[model samples]
Target: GTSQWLRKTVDSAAVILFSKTTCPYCKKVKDVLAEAKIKHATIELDQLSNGSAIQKCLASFSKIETVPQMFVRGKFIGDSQTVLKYYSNDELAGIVNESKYDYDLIVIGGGSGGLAAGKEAAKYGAKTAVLDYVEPTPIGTTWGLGGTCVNVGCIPKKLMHQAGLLSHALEDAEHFGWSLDRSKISHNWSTMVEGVQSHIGSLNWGYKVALRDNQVTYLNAKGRLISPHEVQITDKNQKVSTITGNKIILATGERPKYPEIPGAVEYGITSDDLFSLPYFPGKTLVIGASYVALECAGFLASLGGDVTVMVRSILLRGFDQQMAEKVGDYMENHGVKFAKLCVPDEIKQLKVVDTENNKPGLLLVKGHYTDGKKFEEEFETVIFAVGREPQLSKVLCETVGVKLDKNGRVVCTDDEQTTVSNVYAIGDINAGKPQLTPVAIQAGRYLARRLFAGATELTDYSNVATTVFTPLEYGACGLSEEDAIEKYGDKDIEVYHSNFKPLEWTVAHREDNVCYMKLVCRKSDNMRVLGLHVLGPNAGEITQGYAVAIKMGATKADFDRTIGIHPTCSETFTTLHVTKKSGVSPI
Candidate 1:
């Protein structure tokens, strides 16, 4: 099997390997390639903070939710195990040579970023190809290769949360003179999952149609770099094919993470698994502090499950501390059980046996709480939402000479270009950037303009907003109070904050309905709005406009000058008569 026929290289090649220094598999792959006389480059990926490029690139390729992804030429060769297998047979070179020159641009990962780049690159007259390796994209949205946004991440989660919220709405309807059976309001998990799947399928189909309509090539396969300019594609039939490109974009998205816990993998399920599950957990223990974990806890609780959330901190680490705390309070009000400042240490799956009451469906879990004491609990399911990382590794980046940031993210110019001339990465795969679908899409389109159309302007990314759709929408943009206070002294900034109930909530008698708005600015200007945060209805829709305003340098005076749109929550910011005066000494 180790024959010359199995080895080949293209006219030109660039390889980038993304890995962590401590990953044993990464080291193994590095040593193996070194023995093969291949001088591949590597990126550390884990040492950098969020929003860096190298980590994001790894996130893209390693959809399995772990790191150490390898790329040859411009193709992704999968993780350490796959690379080892390919290298052992000495067949790695053949794969690279095959993929090294088929098109002008080849994009791996077909999530939002991948699709967007494919579309934009095609528009710029590049021979483009998009490969989506994940099958039957969870939530059914990648119908046309629409990406993580439509298929599994944001759209599906939003829709699911909306469905859960509807249940709450029905529950509140009783106060509005409506009589309904809460028991009869049951949802068929299978049906709902299928519907979501169908919707995703339609979107994926639409994406394909859009690509086809625009003459872009779409392939469903696992794409690996065989050389800098070429990729080897292994199709569903296991047939080997190749595509070469002058330029390549890695838009591969991320999967859910499984934290290090004894016996965790044996009984635990990730968000990805949740997306594909045929049924909901009767009793759920959600792990982690991100919005995803919180949202899932809320969703299960709304559905009448005994839901418990294990949070590693009093404040959900990495988010606006105040906001996370507020959300936690709201979640408690909504009846979600909490395990604060703790993590799962071990888990054992018990099968569900409804009649026995000891239903075989419990997970025995162990963790640590804030008091520095250990604790344990039992639940039907355990979900890990700790966060996801890039899948690529140091072997992949180094093999191609791509520079990565300290955190193992792809190192890119503001325009999203890697140090290696023509290669670029976007989305979770690139690392250090907020791993949001919209962000990735923007990166893709922005890079297309620079790489093919001679455009120099970059996408303005500051203040890119996001929301957690757990019942009431949660949205934030620009800086938080903490960020504002950090940048400008507490005395230098004015704060305008308010909380109120919407008219519908009052009429509907929904007790937990509340909205908050915050504006931060320099004290001297009597409240120039430099940042905005909202947690309430229409936050998602409303925040976009405010984000644009913030991006455009809207000051407090500008907000004051704007007119309010009546009866809408967004209009509140514009119409508020009261402003919290800053720069004035406190009484």
Candidate 2:
């Protein structure tokens, strides 16, 4: 470990030797530097009791917290192994200089969207840069370089949720004629966490290699905008360096939003924090009613938690009321407690009730919607799955003269171009509504085409569809009946909806399973489809094909004319027909 003083002392030199004189590797490194005739300085750590200030500095700078550290021209290069490379001094200088500064396109954020943009720009021979903030690499976030889809957000959460579903099936095995002990059927959190980390690590490394192999520059640092075209990069040491680019893209994704409540910070944990917890709580209180909230509540309840889900309003307010209520009903039947139409005032405080186990006991203050009377509930943990928010506070848009909406989302034109010239904001940071990983990736790809490939076409987001990955998948695209009516008038709009159990669930005798489908069309044109909504298995996958079809302007008649795959749930869409005289019905 070395100090800033060591870096300053050797800054004037062309080379640096980081070594412990007592070590064999240190001797080898010293010998190499001498043989190369490279001007160098060394600080031997073995002589000092706690090592010198330089040793301490090097420890913190490298994040290795070990000895035999190294520095070159004020840059913390590496340990003794690096000194023996014996490369050309000029070439080494060029490499270091390039690493410090240089790029044509600098993508801020490493989530999936940022990585895609970086990789895409590099494909066009641009010197692209990806600035990923997290260290120890995997960066298990919902979004960033690999974005949310590959990280802790969708992938990990869904895997865990599905595992819970599997556990439920195992519990019902006895009824299905396979006798088993429900208590013995358990989940290993540590194993699952390790697997998730390993999976993410491989993907993260692949993304970095893809960028490098494609000649893209990679920076593992948090990036902030100094100007529209200039960004400031702060390394782990907090030393700020700058990089300029011809174009900039913001693909930084969102994180769960924590509300302002007393003791919320102490007892409360967001979805991001939950991923790192050693074990699941026996008792849990989840706030909010969006997909994230519902999914977590359902999973935790299945995992045997005394789970209580509280929402400020009725669940899934923006979704179809009937379908939303049915989903809530299903969750309740599976052991999730619903505190509907109630606001949470605060979390009283977290106390260490069991010091040996190291679990904090929490008290939740709940409020009634009508009188606002407060009541208390004891729980081991409180999780807020309210919603996700873009991590843009790091990027000071005002300083760069970039305009953001009142809700703090970066303002972008339909082309995805920001207020500043040559700078674009993609993903959750730019999206005004629900934040999804695929939408961000699509936006990034579309932006790359327009900016680097000389393309004038823009992606139509009108029917950009997505799904919620619960036991019963919920997917939607285009407008709902209300949106159709708002845009086309109630008299001119026709809404067709169907609710039933899928054949697979029916055969399995899973009576609780339910599927809902809705199609909104214009009454005047009855042939044109305005929207599609499906709540059943594979909803996410199902919506993608329909999204492309709708994007190409597919009509209701087109769906009617297409042949359906026999006995398949998705094929039902192809057979959907809107009758003229009767209330719209499925064919």
Candidate 3:
């Protein structure tokens, strides 16, 4: 068949250009490839009698009839416009110029971590390649270049949290002399989803363009660590390719876990699926106590969904217990419900009695309580956020001799070096590292700098700040109160705490809750700040700036010396004086 021959035609060469003699598009495509000086085979479709057969077969196979179609490394890239686009952006240069200079460094997963490392490596002229693969969420949700943080995790979650906060803002408007009717005030789920996706789309395109501009090779492929310095990549076309790197990085970040309950995989969803959720998630049940679970529950409740969080035990397990409890308390006071001390044993589909709703059958969640009571709940969606494991399985790491912990995460040193010296790891998949976006980025950048830029700096993993976007946000840096108390005895640990209501809240006469701040300091060491926690609006913004001071070894006295901005929630840090041991009211 002509189709069989067409396969060999593409497979016979690394770069092939199918063209027509009289077509200006073909001339333009041919001209670019030649100017780029890439070695390629060209077939003029109109040059021979049997050429029409080849053209028809190629078109039928790739479904593109456009002249000057491109096949790079045996994959159909596109026609004239696509060829010109890649060439103009200098992206094609990397694809063709990949030789012994292919991968000075190769990073798996195009998440923020890998992108940061790849971009930095390229800045120092390291021929770096970043290859990524996202096996779509069970619901078939998959996204583009920027990985989970941009497509599903951080960007969309934060934007949705902002949307969720607006509901309270609207309520506050009445006291501030704003004319608004409560009955018609509402949020559109699809609209917010679209806006979040629109911004995410920009970032995805930006990362793709950024990689092109930086002269880094980007591959949309699944990769496994075949050896200490080699990766076996499989593209979507199921084509197998092998590449080597002098230094390889493993940044395949974690994905949300779906429990082994009978129908969880068949019926449940995760944050990976929620951001692009087609329909408004009505009567949703979230299962887990992780920040991912709490954040989703908080935002969904704020968005007017009948949301409930099902937890087996405590919330924010590794975080400060006191601050975690405060978050739970605020959310409980809001519309979000908590299924405390419970575990789901089974899940099944219920018959929908209403044909008016064309959606799927209702989800019936059956679970047992800590008190030995059984409960069956019906909902439209079930999201599993119990925990996440290293994305690459045990088999993948074992094959390459890279050690992984019992939790299925890669075992690496502070320098991110794995058991195999040539291979390294970063991000959430790195066991014991903070699973935050900024932490991964910093670690990746510093790691790349040392690897390629002759730099000696190692990433300081401690004293990094992070935020939990529960209804009342929690931002903390350095250590948790529990960690601080354990590191330094409770007798030596001085907890200076204060509570204040922001002027914005006062203007709206909103007084149900007061924002709280706590500075954990060592009393015996000039009141050196050990930890800082804030529960308030704009906590992330406040925490980020204070983290700079703390990183510079700021003490309670240092904070006291500096003046705080008035009429802000962050100012409480400067005025905190009440000691927790004194039994003094902090408000």
Candidate 4:
């Protein structure tokens, strides 16, 4: 009877460890399972009244008697030595993770970060799933799986920026003796929209296929954290389902914010809607002074639209102000209008006087200066490009005890672990980190490896490079000059600067001395490079390689020692001579 009972008990559990109360080997095996956080049933035979009988039954079943015996999915997995061997070889996690949970990892967003994390977790033999859903824009613009980048944020923005660049390129072509009729060439907004949307459609399909190929379950639904280890997924039809996981990662990302003024949401469109707009944005009024604002204004103006950017404060806040001003100066020179120190007080829709042509009429954007002056302007479109806020309200972050910062972004430690022990957050939704796509992707992948593959490596968030895609692009890595001065004091820092003309800009008669480069270095630490700022074409490409060098602790001397490609804007770094202390401009 006792042997029959022991057989049923062993067969019932996915993982079971049989042990004696005081056995040292039994404690060792238990510690290993606990450290891996693998769920298992433990039966201490010495504490039971039928302890002797159970020992005899165990001996009969296995043909040997041992205090520590492990069973995985009801098969005997030997003693402490066997378990230790699996643990030492790093094969124990897969076995333990595979047995005890519906999924080893469940990512709560299918954006770049979440997808990378889920796929990476799956690669390590841990079962993984990703859940994502998009809420429709105010004007009912909805997109498929790939979060902001492929849909609205980066992909379409760059394509449209390229469209603007092409217009300028046509003018340059005339200067280069390749143009025939300039006025006859006009941009078709509909055609450009179709091309951008079609490319985005393909990317959505590709993301889905990649997830399937990696054996990661992709769920097209909104995921809300019901608990630390459980997620409730709500589909389009309002049907709800639940899934359990040992570890959960939140990568819910962010959405554009609209100001709380009258008619702002009703009369205005955001970057979310601007990308796929069906109609031509004629005379447009862009509100705010963020990179989004400048990029949108840059492209719209370049595309021959009468674009005016209204700023409540300075442009590109938190970036190097000199570089930011240069971008603004370039945009102003290229026909993008600006209303500095001004903000939109309200937006009102005007009645269409001519309904025969199906015209949407105009929008009256009431504006106010910081000094209390008021004005109103009429335009065909009003776009808000203020900033982005994390998408955390509906995901039930607070319910699950995951703390968020005052800004409503998920709070996490250096390892991306959240307040909840088994929960973590990454990507834009995570506070105090660079909100770039590549940063999110790398952090997600590293996090998955750390959690499931027993990798001890942490994602380093220093010296991350980023590019702002205005008509005149700006790229920088590491600290801004203001931040460097605040951190190391103005007396302890040295700034090397130069303004050179790009080779392409010379023939086009573009503004010379407008393309600039700067390197901020710490004088106290062998002149270690603290920041690299550039304003020119291919800024993204140039800054990326230098970012790697900076991450590896490259100093100003190292930059000067490195050979550079001549007639290139990036080469300016290798030949930086003028210092801020010298107070002389480079020729």
Give the top-scoring candidate (TM-score).
4
TM-score for all models, in order of appearance: 0.77, 0.76, 0.82, 0.84
Instruction: Superpose all Cα atoms of candidate 2 onto the true structure and report the RMSD in Å to 1 decimal.
Output: 15.6
lDDT of each candidate versus the true structure: 0.70, 0.68, 0.83, 0.85
Residue pairs that clash (backbone atoms under 3 angstroms), model 3: none
Runs of candidate 3 with Cα error greater than 4 angstroms are 1-101, 351-361, 394-397
User: For residues 1-587, what per-residue lDDT tens digits would candidate 1 score against the true structure?
Assistant: 11111121111123445678788888887787778654344556565443145444344445544557665543577888898888888887665435435676789888888888778876644557888776442223123466657866677787778778878688778778788966687776667778877887788788889888766788888787656776778888999887778887877666666777776666777676675466667778888877888887877787677788887765456556777777788888888988877766788666642433323256788777768898777777888888876655511446787776665677777767777666788887675687788888888887765555434467666777877776566788877777788888888877776675666787777654356777777776556676787777767887888887877778877888899887887887885544566333211
lDDT tens per residue, model 3, 230-262: 788999999998988877888989888889889
Candidate 4 Cα errors over 4 Å, as ranges: 1-98, 351-361
User: How would you encode candidate 4's per-residue C-alpha lDDT over 268-321 as one tens digit per residue?
Assistant: 889998998877778998998988999999999988899999988899999999
- What candidate 1 gets wrong by more than 4 Å, as runs, is 1-100, 135-144, 352-360, 394-397, 524-526, 577-587
TM-score leaderboard ranking: 4, 3, 1, 2
TM-score of 1: 0.77
Summed backbone clashes in each candidate are 92, 21, 0, 0
**Which scores better on TM-score, 2 or 3?**
3
Ranking 2 against 4 by TM-score, winner: 4
TM-score: model 4 vs. ground truth: 0.84
RMSD of each: 15.3, 15.6, 14.3, 9.7
